[PDB]
RNA sequence: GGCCCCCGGCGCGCCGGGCCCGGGUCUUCCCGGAGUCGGGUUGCUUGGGAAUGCAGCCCAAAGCGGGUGGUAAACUCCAUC
RNA sequence: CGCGACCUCAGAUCAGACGUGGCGACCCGCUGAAUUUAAGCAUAUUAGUCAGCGGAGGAGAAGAAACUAACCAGGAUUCCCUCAGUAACGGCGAGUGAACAGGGAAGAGCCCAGCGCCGAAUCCCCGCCCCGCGGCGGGGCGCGGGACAUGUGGCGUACGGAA
C-alpha cells in the first residue's frame, strides 16, 4: 500500500539516484564510417561475389525467399546471419534491376 | 590507406591469385626445400599486422606442411589395451597445423627466434604457411628498445614451448567461465595444485 | 564392508597420491620472510605511506553482501575527472586507478579525494629540489614538520545510520506486509501473460468496432 | 585465363609516350643522397643569413609510396598517376585503377618497376604521381 | 668490540651529450587485428550436462557488428566486454 | 647479339656474428598405457598419471577482460583460507569435481599494426680522427657502402585520439 522499496524483476536502481555517465569508448567500435563504407563498397565491385552468393541471388531472381534463406543458412550457419544477409543480397539485386530498367 | 584495401581484399576470396601462386610454391618446395627462405613477406598486410618491420634483421621462411588426421603409430595398427584405447583411423592431433609448421621452421633454423606465422595457401593435401623470424643478435634489432624482449633468454625458442599465437590456442588458455581447465596458468598446473592434499601444521 | 554409516572419500589414486605435498613446515619461516620484506621496503620508501595507494570505497556484488563496503581496486576515471585530477598524475601523487570500473554513484570523491589531498597537505608532496621553484608546492608542512613514519592503511569500515525513537503512525500499522509481499511477487511473474491476453481480447474487441 | 582485374595490367603504355613521361619526370625527381646532405648543410648556413632553413618552399616533386599515392588519390589531390605493371603480389595495386576510375584521376600503366626505382635513389617504387607541376610545364603535362 | 684491505651505497660539488616537450574550453576529422570468428561433422578431453576446451575435414562471413548472459529453437527487449 | 636495371636463385677457407651438447629438483608443449578398483568385465576408475620426446630459467607459465555478474554491483595475473566433498558428471554403481561471491599475501602498468600528419625526418656497415675501453661504447671528419616507397623514425592504441 504505502509504497515501500522492493525491487520486482530486474532493476538498475530502486533506491539510488541513477548517477549520470557518458558512454565508454570501447562500445563505439563497430559502426561504419563515410570512408570505410566507401572502401568496402569499392572493393566489393572490384572483386565480385562468391558462388554461394550468386546462387542465392539467382534464387531471389526466381523469388523463392523461403528457399534462398535455407540456402544461405545451410552454408553460413546461423539464422541471425542468414536473416541479416538475405537483406544485403536484396537491396543489391534491387539496385541491379533498378539500374538496368534505368 | 592502401593497407585497408589490401586487408579487405584478403578478407574477400574467390579470385584466382591463390591458385596461380600456390603452385609457385608446391613446385618449388619439391624442386628446392619444403622449408625455404622467402625474400619478402608475400602479405605485407598480415606480416605487419602480426608485428613485423622490414628493418634489417627480419626473415620469413615459407614452409609446407602435410595435412590430415593423425594415425596412431603402432605395428600393424592393433593397439594392445582395453578397447576404448583402440582406434587409429580418426585420431586428431592436439595442436594447430599452423603451430606444427611454426615449430618445424624454428627447430630447423636455430639462432632465429619465432615471432608468428600466417596462412598463404592450402591445396588438397597440404598447407602453405610462412613464419616471421627475428635475428636476435643483430645490432639493428638489439638497439631498438621497443622490440628487444626477443633478445633475453627467457624466450629462447618460444615456439616449442608454445607461447606464440599459433600454439597458445591449443594450451586451452583463456579468460572466463569457458576455461577452468587452466585457471592456474596451464592445463598441468591447474591440475597439479587441485589434486594435491593439503596438510597444514595444525589440522 | 560397513556396519552403520555410508560415507565415501576421495584420497585414492592407485598410483600414489603420496607424491604431493606434505611440506607446510615453511609456514613460520615464510611468515618471517614476508614480514622482513615489508620491513625492508617500508624502510626503503620511507615517507610514502605504508600500504601505498589510497583505495576507493565500493559496494560488493551479489545479494549475499550488498550492504557492506570495502576497499575496491582503484579510483575510476570519471570520478577522477569530476575530482579534477589528471589520470597520469593521480598515480604519481599516490592514488589507485582502474579504468575498467564504470561508476553509477560517484560517492567516492566527495570525501576520499578531498580528504586525501587534505592529508597530503597536512604532510605535503615534498618538492623535487630543496629549493621549490614550481617543481614542488606548499612545502610549508615540512617546513613545519613531517612524519618520520607513515600512515598505515586508510580507514574504510565505519558507517551505520542512527535509528531514533519515533512514535508509531497509524497508516504504517494499517499496512499489511505479508499480503504485500506475496501479491506483488505474483504480479511480476504474471505480468507478461496478462499482456498477451489483453492483446488477445483487444483483437476481437476492435474487429467488432470495425 | 587471367581475371579482368589482372588482364588490365597488360595494356601498358606506348614506349615513346612513356619516354615523354619520363623525360618530364627527370626534371622533377626528388632529392637523392649526397644532394640531400649538401642542400641541408647549405640551408643550415643560410639560417644565420635569414634566407633559408628546413621549413621553406619545395617546388612540386614526386610522391612514391603506395600509401601516400592512394591517400592523395582518395583525397583527389592527384593530377597524374603512374603504375609499375610488374609488382610481386599483384594484390598490392590490383584495386588502384578502379580507384582512379571512381575519382576521375588520370592514371597509366608503365612497364617496369625498375624505371620508377631509377626515378629516385631507391631500387624500385610501385607507383609515382604528379599532384601539381610548374605552370610552364603544365601544358606539356596536360597533353600527355 | 678494535685494526687493515676490495667491492657497493644513496646525496653533494664538477664537466659534458641530447631532450623544449604541458592543462583547460570550444569547432572540425579519425578510428581497428580472416580461411579468423562462426555453422556442420568425427575423435579426444572436461564437473560442463541437446555438445567446456582442443584439434582434422567440409562450409565460411558482418560490421548499430561480433562474443558472452550454463537446455536446443524463433521473436523481442536489457546488461556486459 | 651488346650494355644496364629489378626480380628471382646460387657458391665461397669471403667480412663479422650465432645454434647444437649436459643437468634435470621446480616450469612449459606434445605423446601417453596397465596393473589396481567396481567383489565378475568392456563404458567408467587407476589417469591426462609412470614410462617416451622436445624447450628453457632463476624462477617458468600466467597478465591487463570478446571477464564476473544480475546486485545499491564488481574490475588483469598468480598464491593461501574459504566457497566444498557443494553445484554437476557416472553400467547415476564404483568413484569422479570445479567455479563466482567474501577475508587475505602481493600489487602496476603498458606497446604496435591499422586510420592519419611530419622533406625517409629512420637504421646498419666500413675508413679514419679525439675520450674511454676486461658489457666495444661518447663526440666527430668521412662529396664513404647499403637496407628501407612491397613502409623506417617522431606523434598516437580504445582509459578515446588528432588538428
DSSP string, B44-85: HHHHHHHS---STTEEEEEEEE--S------GGG---SSTTS
C103 vs A contacts (CB less than 8 Å): 19, 21
CB distance C46 to C73 below 8 Å: no
Whether residues C103 and A2 touch (CB distance < 8 A) is answered with no
Q: Are strands B58-65 and C57-59 parallel, antiparallel or unpaired?
A: unpaired
φ, ψ (nearest 5 deg) of residue B60: -130, 135
Q: What number of other Cβ atoms are within 10 A of residue D115's Cβ?
A: 18
In sequence order, which residues have a C-beta less than 8 Å from that of residue C137 and are 6 or more positions away?
A: C124, C125, C127
Name the nearest CA neighbour of B105 among B95, B91, B116, B96.
Answer: B116
Return the DSSP state at C155: P
Q: Are strands D80-84 and D107-110 parallel, antiparallel or unpaired?
A: parallel
- Residue the block writes with cell 600456390: B22
Q: What number of other Cβ atoms are within 10 A of residue D142's Cβ?
A: 11
Q: End-to-end distance of chain A based on CA atoms, in angstroms?
A: 68
C-alpha cell at B143: 638497439
Whether residues C188 and A8 touch (CB distance < 8 A) is answered with yes
Q: What number of other Cβ atoms are within 10 A of residue D95's Cβ?
A: 21
Cα C51 to Cα C53: distance, rounded to the nearest angstrom: 7
D74 vs A contacts (CB less than 8 Å): 35
CB distance B58 to B133 below 8 Å: yes
SS3 call for C59: strand
Å between CA of B39 and C1' of F6: 14
The shortest C-alpha distance from B84 to chain D (Å) reads: 50
Cα D95 to Cα D5: distance, rounded to the nearest angstrom: 8
- Give all strands of the β-sheet with D80-84 in edge-to-edge order: D107-110, D80-84, D127-130
Q: Does A49 touch chain B (CB under 8 A)?
A: yes
Task: Locate the chain A residue with the closest alpha carbon to D95.
Answer: A46
Resolution of the experimentally solved model in angstroms? 3.6
Q: Which of D5, D94, D99 sits opposite A42 (nearest CB)?
A: D99
Cα D102 to Cα D109: distance, rounded to the nearest angstrom: 17
Å between CA of B31 and C1' of E19: 55
Cα D117 to Cα D114: distance, rounded to the nearest angstrom: 5
Name the nearest CA neighbour of B120 among B21, B34, B7.
Answer: B21
- Residue the block writes with cell 539516484: A17
Q: What number of other Cβ atoms are within 10 A of residue C105's Cβ?
A: 12
Q: Which residues on adjacent β-strands are paired with residue D81?
A: D107, D129
CB distance C78 to C106 below 8 Å: yes
Q: Give the side-chain half-sphere CA count within 13 A for A4.
A: 11
Name the nearest CA neighbour of B159 among B92, B104, B119.
Answer: B104
φ, ψ (nearest 5 deg) of residue A13: 135, 115
Please, which residues 40-79 of chain C have a Cβ atom closer than 8 Å to chain B?
A: none
CB distance B66 to B97 below 8 Å: no
Cα B17 to Cα B120: distance, rounded to the nearest angstrom: 11
Mark out the alpha helices in chain C (DSSP H runs).
Answer: 27-44, 77-83, 87-90, 109-122, 140-143, 170-174, 177-207
The shortest C-alpha distance from B2 to chain D (Å) reads: 5
Cα B180 to Cα B167: distance, rounded to the nearest angstrom: 19
Burial A71-89, CB ≥16 within 10 A → b, else e:
bbbeeeeeeeebeebbeeb
Q: Which residues on adjacent β-strands are paired with residue B134?
A: B58, B113
Mutate to test the interface with C, among B197, B202, B203 (most CBs of C within 10 A): B197
Return the DSSP state at C185: H
Q: Does A41 touch chain D (CB under 8 A)?
A: no
Å between CA of B173 and C1' of F95: 29
Q: Give the side-chain half-sphere CA count within 13 A for D66.
A: 24
Which method was it determined by? cryo-EM
C87 vs A contacts (CB less than 8 Å): none
Whether residues B199 and C21 touch (CB distance < 8 A) is answered with yes
CB distance D110 to D84 below 8 Å: yes
Burial B14-49, CB ≥16 within 10 A → b, else e:
ebebeeebbeebeeebeeeebbeeeeebbbbbbbee
The shortest C-alpha distance from A46 to chain D (Å) reads: 7
CB distance B136 to B113 below 8 Å: yes
C-alpha cell at C22: 606434505
Cα B47 to Cα D89: distance, rounded to the nearest angstrom: 14
DSSP B107-131: HHSTT-EEEEEEE----SS-EEEEE
Task: Locate the chain A residue with the closest alpha carbon to B13.
Answer: A50
The shortest C-alpha distance from D86 to chain A (Å) reads: 19
Q: Does C105 touch chain B (CB under 8 A)?
A: no
Amino acid at each position: 500500500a504505502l509504497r515501500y522499496p522492493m525491487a520486482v524483476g530486474l532493476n538498475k536502481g530502486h533506491k539510488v539516484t541513477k548517477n549520470v555517465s557518458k558512454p565508454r569508448h570501447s562500445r563505439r567500435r563497430g559502426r561504419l564510417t563515410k570512408h570505410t563504407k566507401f572502401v568496402r563498397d569499392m572493393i566489393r565491385e572490384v572483386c565480385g561475389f562468391a558462388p554461394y552468393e550468386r546462387r542465392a541471388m539467382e534464387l531471389l531472381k526466381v523469388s523463392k525467399d523461403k528457399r534462398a534463406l535455407k540456402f544461405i543458412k545451410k552454408r553460413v550457419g546461423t539464422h541471425i546471419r542468414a536473416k541479416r544477409k538475405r537483406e544485403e543480397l536484396s537491396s543489391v539485386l534491387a539496385a541491379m534491376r533498378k539500374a538496368a530498367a534505368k | 590507406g592502401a593497407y585497408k584495401y589490401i586487408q579487405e581484399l584478403w578478407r574477400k576470396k574467390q579470385s584466382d591469385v591463390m591458385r596461380f601462386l600456390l603452385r609457385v610454391r608446391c613446385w618449388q618446395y619439391r624442386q628446392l626445400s619444403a622449408l625455404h627462405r622467402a625474400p619478402r613477406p608475400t602479405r605485407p598486410d598480415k606480416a605487419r599486422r602480426l608485428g613485423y618491420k622490414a628493418k634489417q634483421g627480419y626473415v620469413i621462411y615459407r614452409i609446407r606442411v602435410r595435412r590430415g588426421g593423425r594415425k596412431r603409430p603402432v605395428p600393424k595398427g592393433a593397439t594392445y589395451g582395453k578397447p576404448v584405447h583402440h582406434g587409429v583411423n580418426q585420431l586428431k592431433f592436439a595442436r594447430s597445423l599452423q603451430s606444427v609448421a611454426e615449430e618445424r621452421a624454428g627447430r630447423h633454423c636455430g639462432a632465429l627466434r619465432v615471432l608468428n606465422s600466417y596462412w598463404v595457401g592450402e591445396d588438397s593435401t597440404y598447407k602453405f604457411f610462412e613464419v616471421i623470424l627475428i635475428d636476435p643478435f643483430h645490432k639493428a634489432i638489439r638497439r631498438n628498445p621497443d622490440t628487444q624482449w626477443i633478445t633475453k633468454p627467457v624466450h629462447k625458442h618460444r615456439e616449442m614451448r608454445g607461447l606464440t599465437s599459433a600454439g597458445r590456442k591449443s594450451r586451452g588458455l583463456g579468460k572466463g567461465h569457458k576455461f577452468h581447465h587452466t585457471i592456474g596458468g596451464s592445463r598441468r598446473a591447474a591440475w597439479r595444485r587441485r589434486n594435491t592434499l593439503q596438510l597444514h601444521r595444525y589440522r | 564392508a560397513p556396519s552403520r554409516n555410508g560415507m565415501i572419500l576421495k584420497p585414492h589414486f592407485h598410483k600414489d597420491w603420496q607424491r604431493r605435498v606434505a611440506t607446510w613446515f615453511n609456514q613460520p619461516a615464510r611468515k618471517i620472510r614476508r614480514r622482513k620484506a615489508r620491513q625492508a621496503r617500508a624502510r626503503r620508501i620511507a615517507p610514502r605511506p605504508a600500504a601505498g595507494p589510497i583505495r576507493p570505497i565500493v559496494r560488493c556484488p551479489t545479494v549475499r553482501y550488498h550492504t557492506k563496503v570495502r576497499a575496491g581496486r582503484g579510483f575510476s576515471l570519471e570520478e577522477l575527472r569530476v575530482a579534477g585530477i589528471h589520470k597520469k598524475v593521480a598515480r604519481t601523487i599516490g592514488i589507485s586507478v582502474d579504468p575498467r570500473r564504470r561508476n553509477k554513484s560517484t560517492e567516492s570523491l566527495q570525501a576520499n579525494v578531498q580528504r586525501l589531498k587534505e592529508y597530503r597537505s597536512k604532510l605535503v608532496l615534498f618538492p623535487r629540489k630543496p629549493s621549490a621553484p614550481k617543481k614542488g608546492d606548499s612545502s610549508a608542512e615540512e617546513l613545519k614538520l613531517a612524519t618520520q613514519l607513515t600512515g598505515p592503511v586508510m580507514p574504510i569500515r565505519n558507517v551505520f545510520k542512527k535509528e531514533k525513537a519515533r512514535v508509531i503512525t497509524e497508516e504504517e500499522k494499517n499496512f499489511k506486509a505479508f499480503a504485500s509481499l506475496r501479491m506483488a511477487r505474483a504480479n511480476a511473474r504474471l505480468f507478461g501473460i496478462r499482456a498477451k491476453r489483453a492483446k488477445e481480447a483487444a483483437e476481437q474487441d476492435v474487429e467488432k468496432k470495425k | 585465363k587471367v581475371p579482368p582485374a589482372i588482364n588490365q595490367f597488360t595494356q601498358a603504355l606506348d614506349r615513346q609516350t612513356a619516354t615523354q613521361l619520363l623525360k618530364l619526370a627527370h626534371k622533377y625527381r626528388p632529392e637523392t643522397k649526397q644532394e640531400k646532405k649538401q642542400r641541408l648543410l647549405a640551408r643550415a648556413e643560410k639560417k644565420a643569413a635569414g634566407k633559408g632553413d628546413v621549413p621553406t618552399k619545395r617546388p612540386p616533386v614526386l610522391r612514391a609510396g603506395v600509401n601516400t599515392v592512394t591517400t592523395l588519390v582518395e583525397n583527389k589531390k592527384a593530377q597524374l598517376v603512374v603504375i609499375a605493371h610488374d609488382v610481386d603480389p599483384i594484390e598490392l595495386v590490383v584495386f588502384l585503377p578502379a580507384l582512379c576510375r571512381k575519382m576521375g584521376v588520370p592514371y597509366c600503366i608503365i612497364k617496369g618497376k625498375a624505371r620508377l626505382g631509377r626515378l629516385v635513389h631507391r631500387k624500385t617504387c610501385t607507383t609515382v604521381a604528379f599532384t601539381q607541376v610548374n605552370s610552364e610545364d603544365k601544358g606539356a603535362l596536360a597533353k600527355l
